[PDB]
Design a protein around this ligand. Structure first.
Ligand SMILES: CCCCCCCCCCCCCCCCCC(=O)OC[C@H](COP(=O)([O-])OCC(O)COP(=O)([O-])OC[C@@H](COC(=O)CCCCCCCCCCCCCCCCC)OC(=O)CCCCCCCCCCCCCCCCC)OC(=O)CCCCCCCCCCCCCCCCC
Ligand SMILES: CCCCCCCCCCCCCCCCCC(=O)OC[C@H](COP(=O)([O-])OCC(O)COP(=O)([O-])OC[C@@H](COC(=O)CCCCCCCCCCCCCCCCC)OC(=O)CCCCCCCCCCCCCCCCC)OC(=O)CCCCCCCCCCCCCCCCC
Ligand SMILES: CCCCCCCCCCCCCCCCCC(=O)OC[C@H](COP(=O)([O-])OCC(O)COP(=O)([O-])OC[C@@H](COC(=O)CCCCCCCCCCCCCCCCC)OC(=O)CCCCCCCCCCCCCCCCC)OC(=O)CCCCCCCCCCCCCCCCC
Ligand SMILES: CCCCCCCC/C=C\CCCCCCCC(=O)OC[C@H](COP(=O)(O)OCCN)OC(=O)CCCCCCC/C=C\CCCCCCCC
Ligand SMILES: NC(=O)c1ccc[n+]([C@@H]2O[C@H](COP(=O)([O-])OP(=O)(O)OC[C@H]3O[C@@H](n4cnc5c(N)ncnc54)[C@H](O)[C@@H]3O)[C@@H](O)[C@H]2O)c1
Lengths: 120, 50, 417, 134, 198, 75, 68, 75, 75, 75, 75
């Protein structure tokens, strides 16, 4: 007679795999938007819940960020080595130009940088 | 005349007539007496005269 | 500075019947005359749904606050309004009787009653469309729903299985091309069949009461019928929905051509609300045949009773009854009416321009542009097979169109030109 | 819908002073929180006046009334149709105050949670009435 | 810690280990709580998403997980205030003035007893200067009591009491109520004994 | 170069401005909750819930800026 | 106060006006004095069960209160 | 050159000013909703909706500023 | 070098800005509590717990700021 | 050296900002205590206690800044 | 050297910020005291005392600032 003492007020939820099936995912959350495309639809179709998706993508992010940061260390010079060589000589070209137009006192100190606009 | 319980629940919805000098929680109970005593006081006079 | 005119008068010099397009004309008619005239408006319904973004609304690209607008907002503050329908029209006496019975006189009448929806044409339809769970869907939302109801967005999503029917009522009806969502559903329902969300034994057919989809544009109707076949959709012409049983999910159809009716099980049903001609326009002898106003195609002026005009859907014009089509009709009516009050001639002619988007995919569309003679402009049926071009044009109509109807009703933004 | 310029009704269970009057120009009373002023076009609202003073201006002098009264407590209601009604337990003029006759045997009170507030009000009126005479 | 003074060469040994223990196991309390939520643990913190992009929520969900720990780790700044304020008082008391002028029969003759010791402070020393030194002493100890007594409560009232009130709860719905109906039947079986007034 | 680096670290300090407004916005929200509670203590649940929900959005902007801070500091 | 008198104690508004005038009943003219009078009888109605006379009207006699 | 670049990153930091005001304005709006709820809690859904709606308009300015930031940061 | 270090210490001063708003937000919070308390003292306990609770979240941001302060000053 | 000290002492001056806000919050706190007392003076002592309690949490932030001030001024 | 002296004399000026906030806080406190007095004049002496008490707390910050000011100006 265990069903005699079972309280039906526990039917407020339908718990299955640590998830309540009576959740209006169509009106709240990442699943509410109906303008989602083939990829976003196939993604939720697999997991059925944003909670499981967000939880898995939580760790996948550390994996991807640590990977791209590695590739940017190992590789990367393929697309930025030019901007470094340019700034290297540019940092020297502008320094050589400063020594030409700058007031140096009896010691090598630019004590008058605001003498004119070109000096600033 | 409706009882206190029905009158209070009905009166708390009052919004057209502002009640801020006494707060609604007090004005609801006070105006209930006026609503009840007025009818009672009026009836006694009619019966006493009759 | 300026004072609001009185609404409790016995007669006016201009009278508009309608708020959707009748309010846009008044707000535009005043700015054209600077308020030299007193115009009255009398609409029937308090709320005007933006059916031009109905599909973006079903995709939840537009919130319910940008899809629902009160009729008062379309009308300006200076012009008075009253939500009472006209009970009868007396052209010989130049007056109008309202539901209450107050006689009102006029010098110029503009009719914009459009096509009034009649849910009673389909028994058991409104009762099922209001149910938050029954799979019966329609083209508009009832007035008994609150902000927490989103059943409109479940027609495409909740089609896990069963027989689907897309019903089109008998012409004239409202929402010819702006409510055809059977191209986006096919693409969305194509994905479901790929991963099993949609059962393989399902049937979706288009039940068209009319013989053709677009009556006044053959080039547009040819593309639709051509694209339906390439996609694999089935159609049944001359058949119109007749009854809806919410208990057993039975839909009684009838082939008007053969008069043979049948009953078919459904699990996801969509139907454009059918219209119905109003008798007070026939008692006055204004409509012609189908029930549309008999007015000129160029000047929009009524054949008889030159002091009466008509625009929108109620007008009998060989063109697609759209909103952009109405934009060009507002400028013409306010012009001719402006010339009628001055006795001058009518130099404003309407070319029959009508512009409505056709959503060919989940995020792609193509504009159906055509003049009176069905001839299309540079936009007619462009980027129809999808692509980057249709994608951008889709976002511009879904994310930036409902934000404009607030201005149209206010007055800050006028028509296209 | 709407009513005329205004109408005020001052009634007492034992006598009616003004069934309906319009000549008055303004009304001022003291509520629990602060003093208010009810005149023409005053929005709809409810008020409960403790036993304080009630002063009302008359454009034309009304017989038997001075326009300055001390009420023992009443209810006030301003209906939506620009109409206010004043109902008090009792009313009298300041000239009949007969001051210095207070505390003539009713000083005793009971030490309870209700008697504390009971005396609180009684003391408030004494302090009020003394000022009302001025 | 007095009874541990002979148990090692460091009087505060047990206190130095306990502060690390206290830190590690309090640092693990949030970690095991997420393990108890499961893979949905991010919904228990932030709730439902807003955008369809998982990458976008990924950034909002990371902030939710950091805040989850910052509510805890940020409360250790309170402990620093308690220590800093405790040291400031030990410094003032340890460096408080004590001289042979306060000693009875001092034999520390070389400790400024036989020298000229003048100052440039306010005279009436015991009336102006020395009371002021005790005035500041009373301030250092009153400020210390307020900080340690207030920050001590705020630490546990937030790290445990409030932290668990936000992320944990108890349900009101019940699954079985067979005690209520047995007590009624059991009370009828004892109806006669109660009639005797036990 | 060296100055732009100095501005980056400087902008990171400016990120503490929402932190200041977030504190005031919190006291203001809880100050109203107290009043709103005394006016009608029957509905503690809704008021209390809407409070933290507001607090959520308030602090959301706070951490949003912190992200923007480190972003400009390294990008 | 009129508000807290009813909140922290079951004192109706009428009872409050009575206790308020209680201290000035003698100051007011006799016209008002005769008006401020409550004297009646209440019986629990069996043949002769109870007969209660309500004459105080200020304490927990006619308008009971939680504080009393 | 680099001077203008320094102002570019500086303006980028300035975008955190509405973020601070958006936080304060949030608490103020919800603080009123709390009081408004206790006053007349029958219209929870109505008042609740208007609250989130207004807030959405706030983040519009916020995101607008950030967009303006990256724009001037790169253009 | 010397410039950036001067800016790091400068930002460390900026952290004292929330400390100011926290004081005002605190007085405002307890200012409302006294009013909310005088309005309905029967429910003091509820108001009181919510009062101190909000205060905790207030100085939480303040402590959070000091973190970022020392961070940039040493990182 | 002195230059870094110059910006340190500059930061040390910033500590007077909470000292300023603390005064305004104090005036606001006692302002509410006065009006709140008038509405329900029966519980004067209760309001008075919570009044001074808030002023303490104010100085909590104040002394905190002064600590942070002197620290960074010498560390 | 000389530059540190300059920032010192400037910080000394910063002490006038609490002097400004303390003024506004005083106006607000007495503003509520007036309204609070009209609400319940029966306790004018109580409100009046607590009123001045708050102001005394306002000057506390004033003395704290000017004190810290002269110190930093000479230390
Ligand atoms: C360069 C360095 C590279 C380094 C590489 C390092 C190595 C990398 C390897 C590892 C890669 C990472 C692994 C990822 C997989 C891991 C799993 C996972 O995370 O999930 C996938 C994950 C899912 O994404 P999601 O965010 O969850 O999806 C969002 C919604 O859910 C989606 O919702 P939806 O599905 O419903 O619909 C989506 C879409 C609808 O989409 C569609 O429908 C299109 C579908 C087309 C399909 C095409 C089919 C093709 C078939 C093949 C061809 C046919 C076959 C022919 C065969 C021929 C054979 C020869 O609807 C929209 O309208 C979207 C909004 C509009 C687009 C917004 C784009 C913003 C970009 C802003 C920057 C603009 C830059 C412009 C200028 C650029 C010039 C360079 O993928 C990603 O996250 C992509 C990366 C996102 C990072 C964004 C941050 C960077 C910002 C952009 C860069 C800005 C420029 C910066 C520098 C510029 C310098 C010039
Ligand atoms: C120096 C490092 C410092 C970091 C220290 C951090 C230490 C953290 C310690 C915490 C403990 C970690 C141990 C985890 C135990 C996991 C055990 C387990 O596996 O049980 C499963 C258990 C899930 O079970 P459940 O939730 O109870 O119920 C599941 C439902 O029934 C399921 O319902 P459903 O069936 O509807 O869901 C569907 C499905 C949905 O799943 C998806 O989302 C799908 C994802 C996409 C998959 C790819 C799809 C590809 C599609 C291909 C399509 C092909 C088409 C072909 C077509 C065919 C064409 C013909 O969901 C799942 O089944 C997956 C759930 C399990 C995922 C477990 C992920 C674990 C990742 C851990 C990686 C790192 C471990 C390192 C350990 C190192 C130890 C030395 O996993 C968890 O509970 C995860 C909880 C972990 C939370 C830990 C958070 C701690 C904080 C970490 C970050 C803190 C940062 C701040 C640092 C501050 C300084 C302190
Ligand atoms: C027809 C008439 C014929 C007769 C006429 C007779 C006329 C007589 C003329 C007399 C001429 C002057 C006498 C000169 C000889 C003085 C000999 C002496 O021992 O003084 C040494 C004494 C210490 O100096 P020193 O040893 O030479 O060392 C040099 C430097 O001090 C060293 O520098 P430092 O910085 O290192 O020193 C620290 C500094 C520390 O800084 C200070 O000076 C401390 C003072 C701060 C408090 C200042 C406020 C005092 C006011 C309190 C009362 C206010 C009431 C009203 C307030 C209303 C507010 C709006 O000084 C001290 O340490 C002072 C400690 C000793 C005083 C504290 C104890 C006082 C006992 C009080 C008991 C009172 C009970 C009643 C008894 C009265 C009779 C015995 O010098 C003085 O204090 C001069 C006193 C000048 C008189 C001031 C007037 C006081 C007014 C009292 C008001 C209440 C009575 C009003 C009566 C009205 C009558 C109409
Ligand atoms: C009352 C509340 C307000 C606070 C005031 C209370 C403190 C009042 C102080 C009264 C002191 C009066 C007697 C002092 C005389 C003896 C000390 C003395 O003379 O000063 C000695 C010396 C100064 O000497 P020089 O500077 O070298 O001067 C040389 C001159 N040729 O000062 C001292 O020795 C310090 C005084 C002794 C400190 C003793 C510490 C006591 C600890 C107190 C803690 C109490 C804990 C309670 C449990
Ligand atoms: N797709 C749809 O289902 C649908 C439905 C309605 C409108 N629309 C769009 O709205 C555009 C313009 O609409 P419209 O102006 O032609 O008509 P309408 O649908 O906007 O309605 C006409 C207005 O007048 C009122 N009305 C109708 N009969 C009335 C009567 N006897 N008395 C008083 N008022 C009366 C209506 O309530 C309404 O305010 C159309 O081009 C169409 O695209 C679409």
């Amino acid at each position: 007679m265990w069903y005699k003492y079972f309280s039906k007020q526990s039917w407020n939820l339908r718990v299955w795999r640590k998830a309540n099936l009576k959740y209006n995912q169509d009106d709240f959350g990442m699943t509410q938007p109906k303008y989602i495309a083939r990829f976003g639809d196939f993604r939720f179709r697999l997991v059925r819940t944003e909670g499981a998706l967000r939880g898995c993508m939580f760790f996948v992010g550390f994996g991807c960020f640590s990977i791209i940061n590695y590739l940017y260390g190992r590789y990367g010079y393929i697309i930025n080595e030019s901007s470094q060589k340019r700034a290297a000589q540019d940092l020297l070209d502008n320094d050589m130009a400063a020594d030409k137009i700058l007031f140096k006192n009896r010691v090598g100190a630019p004590t008058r940088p605001l003498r004119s606009l070109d000096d600033m | 005349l409706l009882p206190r319980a029905q009158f209070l629940n009905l009166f708390k919805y009052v919004t057209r007539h502002e009640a801020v000098e006494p707060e609604l929680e007090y004005s609801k109970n006070y105006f209930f007496e006026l609503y009840m005593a007025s009818s009672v006081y009026n009836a006694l006079l009619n019966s006493s005269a009759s | 500075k300026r004072k609001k005119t009185s609404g409790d008068l016995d007669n006016y010099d201009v009278l508009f019947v309608g708020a959707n397009l009748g309010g846009i004309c008044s707000n535009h008619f005043d700015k054209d005359t600077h308020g030299k005239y007193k115009c009255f408006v009398s609409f029937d319904q308090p709320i005007n749904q933006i059916y031009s973004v109905r599909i973006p609304y079903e995709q939840q690209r537009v919130r319910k606050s940008e899809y629902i607008h009160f009729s008062k907002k379309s009308i300006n503050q200076f012009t008075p309004s009253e939500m009472l329908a006209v009970k009868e029209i007396l052209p010989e006496q130049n007056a109008v009787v309202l539901s209450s019975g107050r006689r009102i006189g006029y010098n110029q009448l503009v009719l914009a009653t459009g096509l009034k929806h009649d849910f009673s044409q389909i028994k058991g339809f409104y009762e099922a469309l209001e149910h938050p769970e029954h799979p019966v869907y329609a083209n508009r939302d009832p007035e008994t729903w609150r902000s927490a109801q989103h059943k409109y967005s479940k027609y495409i999503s909740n089609f896990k299985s069963g027989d689907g029917y897309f019903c089109i009522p008998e012409y004239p009806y409202a929402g010819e091309v702006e409510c055809f969502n059977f191209f986006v559903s096919d693409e969305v329902w194509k994905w479901a069949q790929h991963h099993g969300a949609l059962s393989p034994k399902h049937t979706f057919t288009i039940v068209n009461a009319n013989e053709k989809f677009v009556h006044y544009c053959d080039s547009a109707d040819a593309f639709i019928k051509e694209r339906l076949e390439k996609r694999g959709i089935r159609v049944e012409y001359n058949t119109k929905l007749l009854e809806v049983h919410q208990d057993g999910q039975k839909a009684t159809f009838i082939n008007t051509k053969t008069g043979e009716k049948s009953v078919r099980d459904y699990n996801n049903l969509y139907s454009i609300v059918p219209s119905k001609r109003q008798e007070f326009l026939d008692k006055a002898g204004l409509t012609n045949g189908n029930g549309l106003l008999n007015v000129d195609h160029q000047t929009l002026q009524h054949k008889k009773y030159k002091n009466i005009f008509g625009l929108g859907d109620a007008a009998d014009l060989p063109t697609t009854k759209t909103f952009w089509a109405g934009w060009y009709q507002i400028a013409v009516v306010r012009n001719n009416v402006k010339r009628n009050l001055q006795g001058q001639t009518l130099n404003a002619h309407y070319d029959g321009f009508s512009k409505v988007p056709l959503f060919t995919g989940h995020q792609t569309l193509t504009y159906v542009a055509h003049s009176y003679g069905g001839v299309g402009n540079w936009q007619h049926l462009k980027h129809n097979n999808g692509g980057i071009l249709a994608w951008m044009r889709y976002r511009s109509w879904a994310k930036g169109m409902a934000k404009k109807f607030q201005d149209f009703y206010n007055g800050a933004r006028l028509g296209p030109p | 819908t709407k009513k005329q310029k205004m109408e005020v009704t001052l009634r007492t269970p034992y006598k009616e002073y003004l069934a309906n009057f319009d000549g008055f120009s303004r009304i001022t009373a003291k509520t629990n929180e602060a003093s208010l002023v009810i005149q023409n076009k005053t929005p709809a609202s409810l008020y409960v006046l403790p036993p304080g003073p009630l002063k009302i201006r008359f454009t034309s002098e009304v017989k038997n009334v001075s326009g300055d009264f001390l009420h023992t407590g009443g209810w006030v209601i301003v209906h939506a149709d620009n109409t206010c009604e004043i109902n008090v337990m009792d009313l009298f003029d300041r000239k009949e105050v007969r001051a210095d006759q207070f505390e003539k045997g009713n000083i005793q009170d009971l030490d309870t949670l209700a008697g504390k507030y009971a005396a609180k009000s009684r003391k408030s009126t004494v302090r009020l009435f003394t000022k009302a005479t001025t | 810690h007095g009874w541990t003074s002979m148990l090692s060469h460091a009087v505060l040994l047990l206190s130095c280990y306990s502060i690390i223990i206290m830190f590690l196991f309090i640092l693990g309390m949030p970690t095991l709580l997420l393990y108890d939520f499961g893979i949905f643990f991010l919904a228990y913190l932030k709730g439902a998403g807003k955008y369809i992009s998982s990458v976008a929520e990924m950034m909002f969900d990371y902030t939710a997980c950091l805040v989850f720990y910052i509510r805890i780790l940020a409360q250790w700044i309170r402990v620093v205030l308690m220590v800093v304020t405790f040291i400031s008082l030990s410094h003032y008391v340890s460096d408080f003035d004590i001289t042979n002028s306060a000693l009875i029969g001092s034999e520390n003759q070389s400790d400024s007893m036989n020298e000229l010791n003048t100052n440039f402070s306010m005279t009436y020393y015991i009336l102006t200067v020395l009371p002021g030194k005790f005035i500041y002493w009373i301030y250092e100890i009153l400020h210390t009591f307020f900080v340690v007594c207030s920050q001590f409560v705020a630490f546990f009232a937030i790290v445990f009491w409030l932290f668990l009130f936000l992320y944990t709860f108890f349900i009101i719905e019940k699954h079985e109520d067979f005690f209520s109906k047995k007590r009624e039947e059991r009370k009828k079986k004892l109806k006669e004994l109660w009639n005797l007034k036990n | 170069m060296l100055l732009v680096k100095a501005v980056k670290v400087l902008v990171m300090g400016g990120c503490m401005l929402p932190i200041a407004f977030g504190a005031l916005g919190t006291g203001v929200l809880f100050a109203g909750f107290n009043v709103a509670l005394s006016r009608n203590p029957e509905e503690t649940e809704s008021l209390f819930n809407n409070t933290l929900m507001g607090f959520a959005l308030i602090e959301t902007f706070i951490f949003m800026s912190i992200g923007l801070g480190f972003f400009v500091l390294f990008a | 106060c009129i508000e807290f008198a009813f909140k922290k104690a079951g004192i109706p508004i009428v009872r409050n006006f009575l206790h308020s005038t209680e201290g000035v009943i003698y100051g007011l003219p006799q016209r008002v004095q005769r008006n401020l009078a409550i004297n009646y009888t209440v019986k629990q109605y069996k043949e002769g069960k109870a007969v209660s006379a309500k004459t105080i009207k200020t304490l927990q006699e006619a308008f009971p209160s939680k504080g009393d």
